[PDB]
Design an enzyme around this catalytic site. Structure first.
Site, PDB file in Angstrom:
ATOM      1  N   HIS A 137       3.050 -37.750 -40.923  1.00  0.00           N
ATOM      2  CA  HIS A 137       4.349 -37.151 -40.634  1.00  0.00           C
ATOM      3  C   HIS A 137       4.961 -37.729 -39.360  1.00  0.00           C
ATOM      4  CE1 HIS A 137       7.460 -34.050 -40.037  1.00  0.00           C
ATOM      5  NE2 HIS A 137       7.336 -33.860 -41.337  1.00  0.00           N
TER       6      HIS A 137
ATOM      7  N   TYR B 202      15.631 -25.843 -40.830  1.00  0.00           N
ATOM      8  CA  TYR B 202      15.465 -25.497 -39.422  1.00  0.00           C
ATOM      9  C   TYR B 202      15.793 -24.015 -39.335  1.00  0.00           C
ATOM     10  CZ  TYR B 202      15.657 -30.534 -38.498  1.00  0.00           C
ATOM     11  OH  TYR B 202      15.361 -31.887 -38.480  1.00  0.00           O
TER      12      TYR B 202
ATOM     13  N   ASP C 297      10.897 -27.124 -45.054  1.00  0.00           N
ATOM     14  CA  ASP C 297      11.893 -26.060 -45.167  1.00  0.00           C
ATOM     15  C   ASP C 297      12.984 -26.245 -44.091  1.00  0.00           C
ATOM     16  OD1 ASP C 297      10.424 -25.115 -42.933  1.00  0.00           O
ATOM     17  OD2 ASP C 297      10.604 -23.015 -43.549  1.00  0.00           O
TER      18      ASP C 297
ATOM     19  N   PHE D  28      15.819 -32.924 -42.690  1.00  0.00           N
ATOM     20  CA  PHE D  28      15.858 -33.592 -41.381  1.00  0.00           C
ATOM     21  C   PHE D  28      17.191 -33.607 -40.606  1.00  0.00           C
ATOM     22  CE2 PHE D  28      12.244 -35.619 -43.694  1.00  0.00           C
ATOM     23  CZ  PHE D  28      11.203 -35.244 -42.850  1.00  0.00           C
TER      24      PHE D  28
END
Lengths: 222, 82
Positions: free
Chosen positions: A183, A62, A60, A73
């Site tokens: 991740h 920031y 989701d 990102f």
């Protein structure tokens, strides 16, 4: 083929229209939501269906002021490079010749080259992580992936983390190329992300099909 | 508030830059302990000491603290169950 043609029916669903409604109602009652409304669908604006070469899945947006802008990102110019993106840069520094740490985290140049930076949940309430989960976005992005699987051939999928990997079960692994790894987050980066060579592997796949590689060096638009 | 727990624990008030969702098994492979539900990894960076401070909590809407992990430049980390 454009997003407009394939998503036409989906935009008519009660659930999808009500997701937009919930967000709009929250913004009106004084709740700050990221990104700004005009940027919510930037991933689709910068990377058209037929131009998709690589798909990188995010979670989701920031939840801090001035960070998110509609791409997974990526952060606006002038914003500090977040931990996960910094680790991605490190992987790029020691796997791609001539790459050097960019000094900003703006990734529009990647999107412009065919890299669809898609988050699974498209909005978030300020300071409250994962606050817009299970409202309809997941159903919508599930459909987006399913459409790429169905209407395109030979796309590369970079699935990082277990949550993103599960979403990669809808994908036909013979028609498309799926790559998995832990991740990029500092907690798990040392358990498989560093040295996964995803950025190199991605370019090798494109080269052998006779397509242009991706210049992973992010550039600030002048 | 999340940033308050970090200050209360490290004595430094840091800014959370990202929050990543992880499933119990993922976390276990690193913490050596399996959480009861999915967790969010809230991450802040300490420029003075060059280390990542991670606060792990349950998912929304509770945000219950589970652990605090401090990782240095060598990749070594100190874990604290909360």
């Amino acid at each position: 083929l454009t997003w407009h043609d394939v998503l036409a029916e989906e935009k008519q669903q009660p659930y999808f229209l009500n997701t937009l409604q919930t967000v709009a109602s929250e913004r009106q009652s004084g709740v700050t939501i990221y990104p700004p409304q005009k940027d919510v669908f930037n991933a689709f604006r910068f990377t058209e269906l037929g131009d998709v070469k690589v798909v990188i899945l995010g979670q989701d947006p920031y939840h801090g002021p001035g960070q998110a802008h509609g791409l997974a990102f990526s952060v606006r110019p002038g914003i500090a490079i977040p931990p996960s993106l910094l680790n991605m840069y490190k992987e790029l520094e020691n796997t791609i010749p001539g790459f050097t740490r960019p000094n900003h985290g703006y990734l529009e140049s990647w999107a412009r080259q065919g890299v669809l930076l898609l988050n699974t949940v498209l909005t978030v309430r300020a300071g409250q992580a994962h606050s817009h989960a299970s409202l309809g976005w997941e159903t919508f992005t599930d459909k987006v992936i399913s459409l790429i699987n169905q209407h395109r051939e030979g796309v590369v999928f970079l699935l990082w983390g277990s949550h993103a990997q599960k979403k990669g079960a809808i994908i036909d692994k013979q028609r498309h190329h799926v790559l998995k790894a832990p991740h990029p987050s500092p907690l798990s980066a040392h358990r498989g992300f560093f040295g996964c060579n995803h950025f190199v592997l991605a370019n090798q796949w494109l080269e052998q099909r006779g397509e242009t590689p991706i210049d992973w060096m992010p550039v600030l638009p002048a | 508030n999340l940033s308050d727990i970090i200050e209360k624990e490290t004595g430094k008030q840091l800014v959370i830059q990202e929050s990543i969702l992880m499933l119990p098994e993922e976390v276990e492979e690193v913490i050596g302990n399996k959480p009861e539900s999915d967790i969010l990894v809230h991450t802040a960076y300490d420029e003075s000491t060059d280390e990542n401070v991670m606060l792990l909590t349950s998912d929304a809407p509770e945000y219950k603290p589970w652990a605090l992990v401090i990782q240095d430049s060598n990749g070594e980390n100190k874990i604290k169950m909360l």
